[PDB]
Design an enzyme around this catalytic site. Structure first.
Site: not given
Ligand SMILES: CC(=O)N1CCN(CC(=O)Nc2cnccc2C)CC1
Ligand SMILES: CC(=O)N1CCN(CC(=O)Nc2cnccc2C)CC1
Lengths: 304, 304
Positions: B41, B143, B145
């Protein structure tokens, strides 16, 4: 989101761990620049333990008696000296992995990470608080002496603790990196009174703010209180008295959530008076006091 | 003595963390040999997030679009490929800090340490369990991930998890290092059902053995039970059914304490039926399931 009992990354401290052997005793040492720091009780034997005369025991030791090994490499000891309850072994080689570092004496109620080590090898890392009574509730077995406590501010490691002993009660005691014990403890195998301990009120409040930020809100109520009223409850429940300095340190958390510190005190008062009623806060069924307001801010903002 | 939620020393994993940027998105990558692994992602934008066509989005990207930085040094990307939900960026330089490592897919109920990272920089380390429902309850912000989960067997790091997402419920989901999600999760910003979770019975029993070893014994009783009887209680209280394989893994702890596994089950049964009565076990007011029998043995013997 999510809130965890997080330790600092231990890499910079793993690079400083060495094994120190003197006679039959082996424990851990901290190698920073050309000095290895370790508990002075590495020079004791089983008989000595009850009331060691450290000055006399150290006079029988020469530089060559201190065997210092950094993994596979042997360090050459060119000086030794005792400072309070630590020995400083001057070595002929500066540790190439010496991070930027400071030696600090932490205050009771502050937190730090411990890198538990055995035979100079790291086994694990955990976060803990220096109790108001200057003990720590760690996880230390025989051979863990010399393991250190620390905090990290970007690239600087502030060493605040070196482990020396397990009191007969199973609680732990140690020194700052100048060898001064935290609390009334001495490095002797004697029964030693740890003061009456209290719960770190400012940390429990900080953790209630962490809970609200992360979605656990059931404990918020329609009430408020004063420092005086709250301190009568803190007294009954063996919590540290809250001061304006503690309220001031909770300022950032109060500003972020919009919950006035005294309103959070009224939530804490109701939890002390009524318990959790079989519910949990951030996965805990008790009031957690091992997170400082700084820890909460750092974890809630993602500081590296 | 003492028992703590201990994480593995994170040094070997800190040396592998890099930052990966593609377009406007920055997250963490794991640099092992000449390959950087990161969540796929990293190639998405805000509109894409709801239902990304990853094959199409990646076709628009060239090696030079993946900016990989290991602290201050920039890595040169000479290949890219998507495997399940991970991207593998081949770089022209093997990581000099690559430890001995394996990629493993852990089983639900097993534990691991997480090195939380932001912008390729480690912020903290904590221990957690892969829930029976394949989620983890971590501490991850935007951030984080690409942060990884791992276990360490002396000098070998077994990477078992890479963080991908926070479900709308605030629980976390991710993949093994081949990019296969644990559980039914997909990398889309969609509401996703996490299965019904259960408490990891074998871990709670292991933790009751850790408690007895470390002096907390108040919960031991005059009773015994059978696997059948215990499993009726486990059913009522949403605990995993105990099997002979779990009893067998508790063998070493049973041998060390002399408390038969079914006798410990009868203690656990009484705690499930009566609660803690306002008392604590190893500093907890609930039944802890984030320590496996292996974790208990390792911590109670001082394994490095
Ligand atoms: C790009 C996609 O389809 N997605 C949807 C958004 N997500 C972003 C996501 O989950 N971030 C995150 C992770 N852990 C704690 C807090 C946060 C904010 C990645 C996968
Ligand atoms: C030499 C001396 O006077 N003493 C008396 C014995 N102690 C040894 C000691 O406390 N070890 C220890 C530390 N932490 C956890 C478990 C153990 C067993 C060192 C100081």
């Amino acid at each position: 989101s999510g809130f965890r009992k997080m330790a600092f990354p231990s890499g910079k401290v793993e690079g400083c761990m060495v094994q120190v052997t003197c006679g039959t005793t082996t424990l851990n040492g901290l190698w920073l620049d050309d000095v290895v720091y370790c508990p002075r009780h590495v020079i004791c034997t089983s008989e000595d333990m009850l009331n060691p005369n450290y000055e006399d025991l150290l006079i029988r030791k020469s530089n060559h008696n201190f065997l210092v090994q950094a993994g596979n490499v042997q360090l050459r000891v060119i000086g030794h000296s005792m400072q309070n309850c630590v020995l400083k072994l001057k070595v002929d080689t500066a540790n190439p992995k010496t991070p930027k570092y400071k030696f600090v004496r932490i205050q009771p109620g502050q937190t730090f990470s411990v890198l538990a080590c055995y035979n100079g090898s790291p086994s694990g890392v955990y976060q803990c608080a220096m109790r108001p009574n200057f003990t720590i509730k760690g996880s230390f077995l025989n051979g863990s002496c010399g393991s250190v406590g620390f905090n990290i501010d970007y690239d600087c490691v502030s060493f605040c603790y070196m482990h020396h002993m397990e009191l007969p009660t199973g609680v732990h005691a140690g020194t700052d990196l100048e060898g001064n014990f935290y609390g009334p403890f001495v490095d002797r195998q004697t029964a030693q009174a740890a003061g009456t301990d209290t719960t770190i009120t400012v940390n429990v409040l900080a953790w209630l703010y962490a809970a609200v930020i992360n979605g656990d809100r059931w404990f918020l109520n329609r009430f408020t209180t004063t420092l005086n009223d709250f301190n009568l409850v803190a007294m009954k429940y063996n919590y540290e008295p809250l001061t304006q300095d503690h309220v001031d340190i909770l300022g950032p958390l109060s500003a972020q959530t919009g919950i006035a510190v005294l309103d959070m005190c009224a939530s804490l008062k109701e939890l002390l008076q009524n318990g959790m009623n079989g519910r949990t806060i951030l996965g805990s069924a008790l009031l957690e006091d091992e997170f400082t307001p700084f820890d909460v801010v750092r974890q809630c903002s993602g500081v590296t």
